[PDB]
Each structure stands twice: as C-alpha cells, then as structure tokens.
Design a protein around this ligand. Structure first.
Ligand SMILES: CCCCCCCCCCCCCCCC(=O)O
Ligand SMILES: CCCCCCCCCCCCCCCC(=O)O
Ligand SMILES: CCCCCCCCCCCCCCCC(=O)O
Ligand SMILES: CCCCCCCCCCCCCCCC(=O)O
Lengths: 316, 39, 102, 51, 51, 51
C-alpha cells in the first residue's frame, strides 16, 4: 500500500458541409477541453493550495538544515507523499474522463457528418436511429452511474487521499480514488474496494478535516457515595486535566445521569482532546492515560461499587 | 440548543433526587431467596 | 435545430435522474428549509450541529466534533429535529423504589 | 403546523420536527383528538400459590 | 473462478458458492491478497485492583 | 517428466484467470456477426425499405 505500510455542383455541397461539420467538431472540442481544465484545476486549487505551500516550506528548511526531530522529519516526507498521491490520482481521473468524453465526441461527429452531408440515406438513418435507441437502454445505467460518480468525486468531495474517514462505523483510511471505486484500508489494513455508486448515498465522516475532537469516559459508582466524594472526584479530575494541557483542553464536564434502583449512579466524563482523530493510535494512548488516572482517583478517594444485599431464608 | 447546559441542570436534579431518597429513607430491595440445604 | 433537439432528448433519457436529484435537493434547501447554520439538529437520533449548507450536501458536526457529510438526496426523506427553533424543552428522570415503600 | 411539503410536529419533550409529507403519507397515523374515550392496561403478576 | 455473469467462491469449509456478479457489483469487497501486512487485536480484562 | 507436469500446471494456472475474456469474445463475436449480416443486406441493396 501507499499508506499504512510498515456534377461539381454536388461535390461542392458536400465539401461545404464537411467544413461545417469540422467546425462543429472543433467547437465541441473546445468546450470539452475547457470543462475538463476547469474540473481538474478547481478540484485542488480551491481546496489544498495551502498544504502545498507548507510542504515547500518544510523542504526548504530541510535543505537549509543540511548545510523528536526525526519524528518531524518523517512527518514532512509523509505529507509530501500524500500530496503527490492526491495530485496523481486527480490527473488520472481527469484523463479517464477525457477518454470517455473524447470517444463519444468522436462518434457523434461521425454520425453528424454522415447525415448533414447527405451521405446517409433513408435506410441508413433508420438503422442508426434504432441502434441509438437500443444503446440508450443498454448503456443507460452505465452512463448514469459514471455521471453520479463524477459528481460525488469532484463536486461533493467528502474526502481526499490519505484522509481517515468513517463509513457506517468503520474507520478507514482512503488509499486511492477513482471514478468507479474508492479504495480504503481498514484498521487491520484490509484493502477494501468500495463502489462509488454506494458511497454516494452514505453519510461520510472525515477526521482529517475535523476540528479538535472530544471524548467520553463512562463509569458507575455506588449510590451511597457521599456527595462530597463526588465533589472531590470532580476536583481531582480538573487538576489532572490542567496539568496535561498538551493533551487536554481545560473544558470538561461531569454529568450525573441516572439513579438505578438505589444502588447505582451512572456518570459520564466529557473531555476535549487537543487533536483531531486522524492519528487514531495517539488518541487512544492519551485516553488510556486518562482512564488510568480515573482508576487512581477512585482508589485514593475510596470510591466503591457494591451489589445489592440478598436476604436468605433457610428451610432446614 | 446548548447541551452542556442542559446536562448541568439535569445533573443537579438527579443529585437532588439522590438526597431526597436518603433523607426520606427510600430504598429498593431484592426479593428474598429461600434455600433448602441437603448437606 | 432538429438534430440538437434530438440529442437533448437522449441526454434527458440518460441523465434525467441525476438532474432530478439535484432539483429535489434545491427544493429541500430553499423551500422546505428545516435548518440553518449553527442549529443543532437531530437526524436518526444523532444530535449534530450544522456547519455548512450547500446544494448537494449538508455538513454537520457530531457531539465529538467529527465532521460528517450528508447528501441532501438522503436528508430529503428523513424527519429532522431542530433544537434551535424549539420552545422550552422538557425532560424525564426515571427511577424505581421498593413495593413496600409507604 | 401543516404545509404542502412538510408537517411540523412537536415531540413529548417539545423538540420541533420537520417531517416530509412524501414519507408521512405512507405511514399509518393515529389521531388521539379524533378518538373516542380510550382504554388502558395494568399488567402485574402474583405468586402461583395465591388462593 | 471468474465468469461474466457469476463468481465462484470457496468458503472456509470449502463449500462452493455461486454469486451473481449483479449482486457483487453493489458490495464492498475486501481483498487480502492485495493487502499490506495486516494487524490484529487481543482483548482481555483484569481486576480493577490490579496495581 | 516433472518438468512437463509442472509446465502443464502453470499453463492451466495462467489460463484460469482468462476465462472471462474468452466468454466476452464469444459474446462480442455473436454481436459482430449479426452486425455484418445487416450490413450485407444494406450495402448490396438486397434489402428494401419496408422490411
Ligand atoms: C465503465 C466505463 C469505464 C469508466 C472510465 C474508465 C475507468 C475509470 C476509473 C475506474 C478504475 C479503473 C482503473 C483501475 C483498475 C485497477 O485497479 O487496476
Ligand atoms: C440540473 C443539474 C445540472 C448541473 C450539474 C452540476 C452539479 C450541480 C451544481 C453543484 C453546486 C455545488 C454543490 C456543493 C459542492 C460542495 O459541497 O462544496
Ligand atoms: C418543485 C416546486 C416546489 C414548490 C411548490 C410548493 C410550495 C411550498 C409548499 C409549502 C412548504 C414550504 C413552506 C414555506 C412557507 C410558506 O409559504 O408558508
Ligand atoms: C451470447 C449471449 C448469452 C447470454 C448470457 C450473457 C453472457 C455471455 C455468455 C458467457 C457465459 C457467462 C458465464 C456462465 C458460466 C459458464 O460459462 O460456465
């Protein structure tokens, strides 16, 4: 993988019409070219110009330096690779569009020529007409599918190459984008071919494009836990979070949610990370430490959970 | 529209309910279990 | 003129369904107008903040701020809650007590 | 409120819901306003040995 | 084997299964052969009092 | 003998991934033959326009 890897009278009438057809062809050619240039450019120019400039900056710095450092150097090279891949996939997709459109353009121009010049006769028109109608059914879904895929990829553009996306609960990395399919890597790096015609109807998450993300730690305590210990728990958590501001934002909430029987109080801690979740492993490492801190606080404050007592009657 | 605020207010009500149950001595108990011992 | 019109008919046959979708999305955004930017909406139980509205898609943030892109062609068929536009809301605290409680 | 394309409802907790008529029209709809006096049920259980 | 209208697969127990391509065309398909080295997970639990 | 048996095994292993192409060829050919019949009927002038 790229990511995640370890009778001159009639002769002249003919000629005149041939010239006209040729001009029509050139016109359409010009239209075709223009639309592809617009699509190809705007796709990237209005979305990641700034990432390109950041990449150039860091490489200028590396060249200068040559005349957690290593971690930084690696990140710089991995980001450059991601931009190169996005750039190459876009060029490829546009070239594929170019072939589809060029081919239809050529075919229609042949037909136009044959009919405007008078070469095709009545029987040929009838047969061509039928062939087009039949083709309209056969290739009907195909043409629709490609069109929708184009809109999804270039207009909606929910994700780029290298972004970590969420589809139906599956956190996956985008490896490659094409017109008919998107290729994703699952958390275990299984490669998945996912048709765009399906992807077009789903709600797609994108961690890469997200602002700093939040999280939750749910827990339970005994119903008899004094309100003072609940207050101490809130205070201890605040102190922890404030001593680790490289990982956590100061804002957090402790929510008391439910009293079950008279035995259990359900609670949840809401926190805010200083990162989005593109680096999933880092998210889990930071959360893991917070969970162990909660463990420690409960032990120090003597916060417990007991089961309801059971009354027993003994017969002999 | 503001969920954090909604939950703060709700949490205080949940803790008040806790307090009331304790002050009024309101409890829940499991059904008694009869045991027959055959040694 | 005839040939041009003939091809428009064929194009309609083939791509009319995608045009239909775009149009329906336009009606959703400008006529039905269930939400604005900054409102918290509920879609399938998910409480999400609307960040951006477009013709083909709506961008929302989930409670953990994950950014999510919904096609408008899908939102058009869902019932959408909107907290911003709601009157003062209510709530419930469920609990249980012993049968023998006086 | 009622409109041609969508019906607006309030839930028990008063959130406001926009519900397209294109989906609503294919559902069975109860109406308590138009209903006659309604009934109810209390379910319970007792021991087998209860005389 | 692969054909135009159908794909034939063997399940883990070697049952031979015939899928219409018309349904595979709408599925997300994993491919291990083409995958990079894969990862895994071992889940477990310990007592809360473990130091 | 091992060399010839391995050669056969390899030729089959390679041919097994081309079965879809062979099927497409048959389909395309059938279409092509029909198209040529129609062309013959038209270019020689043997067919008339009502038919
Ligand atoms: C259905 C008509 C063709 C569509 C236009 C050309 C192909 C568009 C790109 C889709 C991916 C095909 C190329 C990559 C195949 C591979 O994975 O090796
Ligand atoms: C009747 C349809 C013909 C036009 C086909 C082009 C696609 C519709 C117009 C796209 C408008 C931009 C949509 C929002 C893109 C975005 O999410 O940023
Ligand atoms: C495809 C055209 C759709 C427009 C035709 C229907 C006119 C709108 C129907 C009511 C729903 C929108 C509510 C707008 C507020 C109002 O005018 O009361
Ligand atoms: C020639 C038109 C026949 C109609 C069916 C369309 C596909 C062309 C025939 C190729 C065989 C398809 C695969 C079937 C399994 C097999 O061949 O054993």
């Amino acid at each position: 993988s790229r990511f995640g890897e370890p009778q001159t009278r009639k002769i002249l009438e003919f000629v005149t019409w041939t010239i006209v057809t040729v001009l029509i062809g050139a016109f359409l050619w010009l239209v075709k070219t223009t639309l592809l240039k617009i699509l190809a450019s705007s796709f990237h120019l209005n979305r990641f110009f700034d990432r390109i400039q950041e990449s150039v900056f860091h490489h200028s710095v590396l060249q200068t330096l040559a005349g957690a450092f290593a971690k930084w150097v690696v990140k710089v090279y991995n980001d450059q690779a991601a931009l190169k891949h996005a750039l190459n996939d876009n060029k490829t997709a546009v070239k594929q569009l170019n072939k589809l459109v060029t081919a239809i353009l050529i075919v229609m121009m042949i037909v136009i020529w044959l009919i405007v010049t008078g070469i095709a006769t009545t029987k040929l028109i009838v047969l061509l007409s039928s062939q087009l109608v039949v083709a309209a059914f056969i290739f009907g879904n195909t043409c629709k599918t490609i069109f929708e895929a184009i809109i999804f990829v270039f207009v909606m553009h929910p994700f780029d190459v290298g972004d970590r996306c969420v589809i139906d609960g599956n956190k996956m990395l985008v490896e490659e984008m094409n017109i008919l399919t998107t290729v994703f890597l699952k958390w275990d790096k299984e490669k998945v071919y996912y048709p765009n015609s399906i992807l077009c109807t789903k709600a797609i998450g994108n961690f890469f494009r997200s602002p700093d993300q939040g999280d939750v730690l749910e827990f339970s305590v005994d119903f008899t836990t004094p309100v003072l210990k609940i207050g101490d728990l809130k205070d201890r958590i605040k102190m922890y979070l404030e001593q680790n501001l490289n990982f956590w934002h100061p804002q957090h909430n402790m929510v008391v949610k439910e009293i079950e029987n008279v035995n259990k109080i359900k609670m949840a801690l809401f926190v805010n990370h200083t990162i989005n979740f593109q680096d999933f492993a880092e998210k889990n490492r930071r959360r893991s430490e917070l969970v162990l801190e909660l463990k420690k606080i409960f032990e120090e404050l003597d916060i417990k959970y007991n089961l309801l007592p059971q009354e027993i009657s003994i017969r002999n």
